[PDB]
Amino acid sequence: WQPQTGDIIFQISRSSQSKAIQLATHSDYSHTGMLVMRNKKPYVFEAVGPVKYTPLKQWIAHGEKGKYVVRRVEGGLSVEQQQKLAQTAKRYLGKPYDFSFSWSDDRQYCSEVVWKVYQNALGMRVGEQQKLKEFDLSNPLVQAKLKERYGKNIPLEETVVSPQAVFDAPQLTTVAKEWPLF
């Protein structure tokens, strides 16, 4: 794998919400970011409170067991497309972490910011949106974490984009994988 600006990278978060996210979204992925080459060095643009750039080596090390998978638009992006993603990403830097998973731009969560950058830079929708209530909220671990964060005021009608949703976007192919399934 030769990292390129725009590559979308996924990992298992070590945060306490990570398991609930995996369960609700039927996914192994609980954190995502987008590669940005800065002076030819790979950084991961990610919404972690705040939205920021992180050196790729450090980003990967933070994932559980160092596991990661990388998706890229099939056939690659042009240099011009890459420069538009990089440019747009700049507009979200410094935004705090979106603890509400709200679709407003005030704060950002991980898959929200990757989705919004692709949409605003290239007009690509990289992933299906659905309502919070449409996820799988049946597991008691999931219900406990929703209670912890939201109490009774769960935003059931909120438009959300999950990491799994971005992963399964039709444009994408896998270009790197260090993820043993044993």
Distance CA 173, CA 176 (A): 9
- CA 76 to CA 96: how far, in whole Å? 31
Q: Where are the domains of the chain?
A: 1-182
Strands 41-47 and 159-160: unpaired
Entry resolution in angstroms? 1.8
Q: From CA 48, how far away is CA 99, in angstroms rounded?
A: 10
CB-CB contact of 45 with 53 (8 Å) = yes
Q: Which residues make beta-bridge pairs with 178?
A: 68
From 3.10.20.30, 3.90.1720.10, 3.30.1490.20, 3.40.50.2300, which CATH number describes the 1-182 domain? 3.90.1720.10
Greatest extent of the chain over all pairs of C-alpha atoms, in Å: 48
Inter-CA distances, 23 with 1, 2, 113, 161, Å: 29, 32, 21, 15
CB 37 within 8 A of CB 89: no
Token code pair at residue 153 = 């005021």
Q: Compute how many other C-beta atoms are within 10 angstroms of the C-beta atom of residue 164.
A: 22
3-state SS, the chain, equals CCCCCCCEEEECCCCCCHHHHHHHHCCCCCEEEEEEEECCEEEEEEECCCEEEEEHHHHHHCCHHHCEEEEEECCCCCHHHHHHHHHHHHHHCCCCECCCCCCCCCCECHHHHHHHHHHHHHCCCCCCCEEHHHCCCCCHHHHHHHHHHHCCCCCCCCEECCHHHHHCCCCEEEEEEECCCC
Q: Are the C-beta atoms of residues 124 and 84 closer than 8 Å to each other?
A: no
Evaluate whether 47 touches 97 at the Cβ level (below 8 Å).
yes
Q: Is 133 left (phi over 0), alpha (psi -120 to 50) or beta?
A: alpha
Token pair in block for residue 165: 């949703």
